[PDB]
Amino acid sequence: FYRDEDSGRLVRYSIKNNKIPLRIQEDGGITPNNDRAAWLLGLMKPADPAKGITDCYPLLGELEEVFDFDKLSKTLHEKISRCQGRPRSIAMAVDEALKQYLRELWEKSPSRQQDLKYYFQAVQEYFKDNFPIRTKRMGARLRQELLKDKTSLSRLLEPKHMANAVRRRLINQSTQMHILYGKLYAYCCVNSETLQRIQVHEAVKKQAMTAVLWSISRLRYFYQFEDGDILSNKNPIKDFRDKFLRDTNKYTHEDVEACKEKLQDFFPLKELQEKIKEDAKGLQETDNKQADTTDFKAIGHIVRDDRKLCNQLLAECVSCIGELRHHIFHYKNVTLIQALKRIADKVKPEDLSVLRAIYLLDRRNLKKAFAKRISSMNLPLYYREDLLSRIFKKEGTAFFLYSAKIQMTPSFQRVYERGKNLRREFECERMKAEASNGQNGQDGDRLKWFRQLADTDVDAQRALRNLLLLIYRHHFLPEVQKDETLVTGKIHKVLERNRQLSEHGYSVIEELYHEGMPLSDLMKQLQRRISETERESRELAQEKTDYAQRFILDIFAEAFNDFLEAHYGEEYLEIMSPRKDAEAAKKWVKESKTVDLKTSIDEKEPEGHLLVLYPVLRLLDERELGELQQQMIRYRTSLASWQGESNFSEEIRIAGQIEELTELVKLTEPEPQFAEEVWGKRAKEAFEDFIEGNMKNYEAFYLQSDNNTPVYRRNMSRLLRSGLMGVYQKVLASHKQALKRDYLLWSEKHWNVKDENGADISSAEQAQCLLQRLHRKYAESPSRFTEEDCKLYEKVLRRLEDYNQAVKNLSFSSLYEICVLNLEILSRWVGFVQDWERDMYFLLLAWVRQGKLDGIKEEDVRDIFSEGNIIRNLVDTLKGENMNAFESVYFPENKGSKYLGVRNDVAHLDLMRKNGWRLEAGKTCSVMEDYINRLRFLLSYDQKRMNAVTKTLQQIFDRHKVKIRFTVEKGGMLKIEDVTADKIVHLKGSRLSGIEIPSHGERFIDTLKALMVYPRG
RNA sequence: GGGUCACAACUCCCAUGUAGGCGGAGACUGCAACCCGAAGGUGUGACUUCAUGCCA
Length: 1017
Hints:
This protein is an all-alpha fold. Helix content is 57%, strand content 2%. It is globular and about 95 Å long. One of its GO terms (biological process) is defense response to virus.
């Protein structure tokens, strides 16, 4: 589908007349392309409240006077009085009576038919939305079901309700058209390739601004500043910033220790100090060597002082964040990339000395960061060296930190499950073929490397999976990037296999790939097909079959298997024989193995834009980095997808550099230095009121115990880094997570399951082995299962689930999951606030352009959104009839003044502080409910944003396998009904009703419910 | 006090109030699928729909 200012092209007349409502007259002006756009743009006329005029849309009032709306309701009531129930009959009767009344009203008034056409279109849209006949979609089904009730039927026919609904619809369409006008002339002064490009650029800028706001909140956390504005140039705040941690009459050693300890969670300060100390020591022993340590020697006096280093690092950070906040939303630079280039041109890297030293120290640490990751996952305690050396050799390897992945590249997990299932199916069919024919076929190894072992524990398969994941991520994908023919070297074969089961589902996929086509185009069409399939499944409320995703998984699994055969064939037997040994685990880390990851980032001189953007990436935890990386991947694919006359090569290269830098920051962990044995002098306090008794009573684990990875430690470090512990100790105080029932259940070693096969289960490993054995026996024989084993399965399942929930509550995994969910609820509202800010900027620009505001210039508009508060600038700038004109676009008459303050509450991230979790006198609701309702009030200029508030909250909750229900109470307020947890359905078709297990425990659900309604609600 | 009734989106367009099409299109406007991915448990292979059978 392609449309332009002329027509539209690939019912038929709807395709042809689908063109843009706006056009450029080649002189900088935008003019309407039809009558409806001109009518929508001229509806808003500002009104003087002192003179007596109240509304800003007089034509809508006159049209609501002409359209009676009172005899229509009586006519419809009289018409449907002879229908009883049967909501479809009511729908046809209402539709017929409505079209009769509309044609009579059109015949009655011939003078004002022109605007009557658009009024009739709005009325017909209302009646089609609320009285549906067809029920193919789900929403139409529930509207028809709601048509059964007589009370809702009476409510839907009120004259005031219908008039207000038509007015709201028309005002919403007018506002959207003004915003579309204002989007142009801010980027332009062909539709398909330009509007999508503007959408992509705005998405990238908004994601960057969310990252900037997160780093601003982190900087305010560092400086311990109460309200105000840290990124300021006026005298008192600047003098406070320049004097921070100076002297001793104002600040104490505890202050500098707390500041440097907060800074250590994001920055490698201790390693930098040790590096400078060893660099100073080495200069006194060599008298003739041209080493690259001149830059490090200049800043030796700063980094040797804690106060000076902290103050200087905070100063350079504040300079970078302030320059980023000044730009990006500037009117000059179209792209964030050229904004970074202009910042790097303005501010030289000679000023940023501590920042560039931190960048260099982090760049020259990948060599041991990769070794730390390899040791951390599973690898050394299941392989007896001299094979990891054959894979991760210390000489130059084909391993890289980050590959510029192509769109819709599958993850390792889906590929692994698909290949493992295909291998199991092949094994079963070969065994069944050996039963029918007693001849041993010499073939049978065509899909190995996905074998499920037969040491055969669950940890051994974990280690094998992790090794294959490392090879897939750092070796196979750069090889595919350099030479894609590997994947193509399999594609035809997979299609043939599908045909071998026809005597199909890949018929749609058989037509796209002819002979030789760039896989990039293939994944773009498969992305389109997957998108339509998912959207249709979501719309029609049915679960369908995804053939394109399965095809992608199949071809990538075949390519991975053949690649592993080509390079690691001599070590297949040694890879498939893991063996647990703690001696190699205690070794391999005292040797400082320092493996040989490679990257394209320079080792002696950082680039200017990368150095400017480095603290922003350094101040994001784990998920905002992923969102920024996905936005950069989408931007790169979008730039590559456009045709000629583009000139976007340098932007593509810089975007790839940003992706690689983000991957480097993600890989190079900040070295949490927990040390000690259990506690230190930070988390201990931040974690007293979550342990039911004392931590010494839980000494069996939390220290030594299994002598393995201590997740509890990574969980507590990542929990304490996020800075939400003060909020959680104010809100979730009486919701202790360690408990004593869970520790008693974990210390239980005398399970009462009474296993049938001449033994008794005493450990969770034996229970997991019984689950695996019983599930394999069920998998081979689904239709024939003994009644004893079917209840034995549930008997071990419930005990294992109780044990796992006790472990998850004890290991602080539930609290960390709640923190991840809470930080996901935030930064969605920040995205909503960014959307509102951009929309209001473009709306005000469009209003000023078409002479709507009298004594207001474009300079004032840009100065509203340049510096200072946006809200205060709007209040001090627009007044009289202009403020009434601005307020005319928010329909919900229940609100009054003091609104738009939720923008300042969200953008400053007040919910990340203890003082923000307080409510006004009254309001009878919870903090989250209050924020939801104020967000609906703020976003009421756009209907889709107002519905997307609750929609996105429900989707975020459902991503964690948790439900949440809302009910609308009196006055239109939303309130939380319940939360609960969904259930995973175990063995199906087992001559039994099916075992049902909740996906989350009661402690997790109760804590999430306590967070959602803090005061009441 | 339907006055913010979301979940069950929103926008645009199909010739003469006629005429439909209660029909189409939309990374063009937002949620999604895909990835982040740790977290993780729900047997598989193969095809139709307003979620249940159909064959080894």
